[PDB]
Design an enzyme around this catalytic site. Structure first.
Site, PDB file in Angstrom:
ATOM      1  CB  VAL A  59      -1.021   0.139   1.297  1.00  0.00           C
ATOM      2  CG1 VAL A  59      -1.726   1.321   1.293  1.00  0.00           C
ATOM      3  CG2 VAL A  59      -1.819  -1.130   1.299  1.00  0.00           C
ATOM      4  CE  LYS A  66      -6.723   5.676  -7.349  1.00  0.00           C
ATOM      5  NZ  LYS A  66      -5.126   5.776  -7.307  1.00  0.00           N
ATOM      6  CB  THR A  95     -11.003  -9.692 -20.461  1.00  0.00           C
ATOM      7  OG1 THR A  95     -11.470  -9.141 -19.272  1.00  0.00           O
ATOM      8  CG2 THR A  95     -10.578  -8.609 -21.492  1.00  0.00           C
ATOM      9  CB  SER A 174      -6.404 -25.077  -3.940  1.00  0.00           C
ATOM     10  OG  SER A 174      -7.922 -25.205  -4.710  1.00  0.00           O
ATOM     11  NE  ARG A 177      -2.937 -24.814  -0.708  1.00  0.00           N
ATOM     12  CZ  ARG A 177      -3.138 -24.308  -1.717  1.00  0.00           C
ATOM     13  NH1 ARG A 177      -2.363 -24.375  -2.777  1.00  0.00           N
ATOM     14  NH2 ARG A 177      -4.338 -23.251  -1.623  1.00  0.00           N
TER      15      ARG A 177
HETATM   16 NA    NA Z   1     -10.291 -13.762 -20.820  1.00  0.00          NA
HETATM   17 NA    NA Z   2       3.308   0.487   2.375  1.00  0.00          NA
END
Ligand code: NA
Ligand code: NA
Length: 326
Positions: A59, A66, A95, A174, A177
């Site tokens: 960050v 923001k 997309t 996963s 796991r």
């Molecule tokens: Na795509």
């Molecule tokens: Na930071």
DNA sequence: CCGACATCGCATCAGC
DNA sequence: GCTGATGCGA
DNA sequence: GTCGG
């Protein structure tokens, strides 16, 4: 960390990530936002300010600003604007189709093609991958319950063994796991006769048997080492038909198999930590091999590896998949 | 200040 | 027809 | 966009 703790902030950041990737074509900004979103998703406190957030690794100044705007106003002017923009919101949305990335979505929106309907009216302009993404658009966005993955795994291990009982197949990701659902199925495959230092239909014959029993229904891509496609469980009597699912299968040479299995089991966080620890203790771990450095800092030959545990041995204690979240 | 930030297999495009 | 680049997904 | 050499 409960969802609604900082869910407004992480959703904003993930939304911003998607626009960077799909619209601005800025992959490094997409990963920055995602990283900020992840470190925040983990922080066990309701964030009260941008400065509070800025402390987290990933960050920075602009995300802190923001957060402040979002905190005081409950929205973000720039995200509100991009959301309402026809060109951009359509590019971002297209997309979601597998095989349509930022660059294909851009061209489509350019020529007036903006929706699944529009793509439907325009099969001629879609490649093979894209037609399949469009065909299974909804199925591909569904999660896979663990119980279905176990049924899928039954089929895969049964049919592999039936092709040649000396194959080794492991379902990784996963699911290995112990996750409760999965996005897709990732199958790693090897055979005694295939090593790095060494037929080239070992993958084809497995894909072929899974199509013969009608488990694999479509092909996205397939070469001598990687297959990517679509499968579905048999529909049980007049009960409703299972969604089509993504399945990848890769053939790995035997002496790289277990580095492969370790990597494609993850998680990601775990991998980075484990590859750190291994640097620290003097070896280099990629997806293929483990190698010694090197007084400064020259990697020598790949070391023999015969199980997952062998890798832990080289760097010092086997952790089972179950406890590989971090 | 300014470059790194996963990495590669396969499908298909661009160049010759 | 071949070779290297790019788009894509993971 | 963020980090760090
Ligand atoms: Na795509
Ligand atoms: Na930071």
């Amino acid at each position: 960390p409960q969802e609604t703790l900082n869910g407004g902030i992480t959703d904003m950041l993930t939304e911003l990530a998607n626009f960077e990737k799909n619209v601005s074509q800025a992959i490094h900004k997409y990963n920055a936002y995602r990283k900020a979103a992840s470190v925040i998703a983990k922080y066990p406190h309701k964030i009260k300010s941008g400065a509070e957030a800025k402390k987290l690794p990933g960050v920075g100044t602009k995300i802190a600003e923001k957060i402040d705007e979002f905190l005081a106003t409950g929205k973000l002017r720039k995200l509100e604007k991009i959301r309402q923009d026809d060109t951009s919101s359509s590019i971002n949305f297209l997309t979601r189709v597998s095989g349509i990335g930022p660059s294909a979505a851009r061209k489509f929106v350019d020529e007036g093609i903006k929706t699944l309907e529009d793509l439907r009216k325009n099969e001629d302009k879609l490649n093979h991958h894209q037609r399949i993404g469009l065909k299974y658009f909804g199925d591909f966005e569904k999660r896979i319950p663990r119980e279905e993955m176990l049924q899928m795994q039954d089929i895969v291990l049964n049919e592999v063994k039936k092709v040649d009982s000396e194959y080794i197949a492991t379902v990784c990701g996963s699911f290995r796991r112990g996750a409760e659902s999965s996005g897709d199925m990732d199958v790693l495959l090897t055979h005694p006769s295939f090593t790095s230092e060494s037929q080239p239909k070992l993958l084809h014959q497995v894909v072929e048997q899974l199509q013969k029993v009608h488990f694999i229904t479509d092909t996205l891509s397939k070469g001598e080492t990687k297959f990517m496609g679509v499968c579905q469980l048999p529909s049980k009597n007049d009960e409703k038909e299972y969604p089509h699912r993504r399945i990848d299968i890769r053939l790995i040479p035997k002496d790289q198999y277990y580095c492969g299995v370790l990597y494609f089991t993850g998680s990601d966080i775990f991998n980075k930590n484990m590859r750190a620890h291994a640097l620290e203790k003097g070896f280099t771990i990629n997806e293929y091999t483990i190698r010694p450095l090197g007084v400064t800092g020259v990697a020598g030959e790949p070391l023999p590896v015969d199980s997952e545990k062998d890798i832990f041995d080289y760097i010092q204690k086997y952790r089972e998949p179950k406890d590989r979240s971090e």
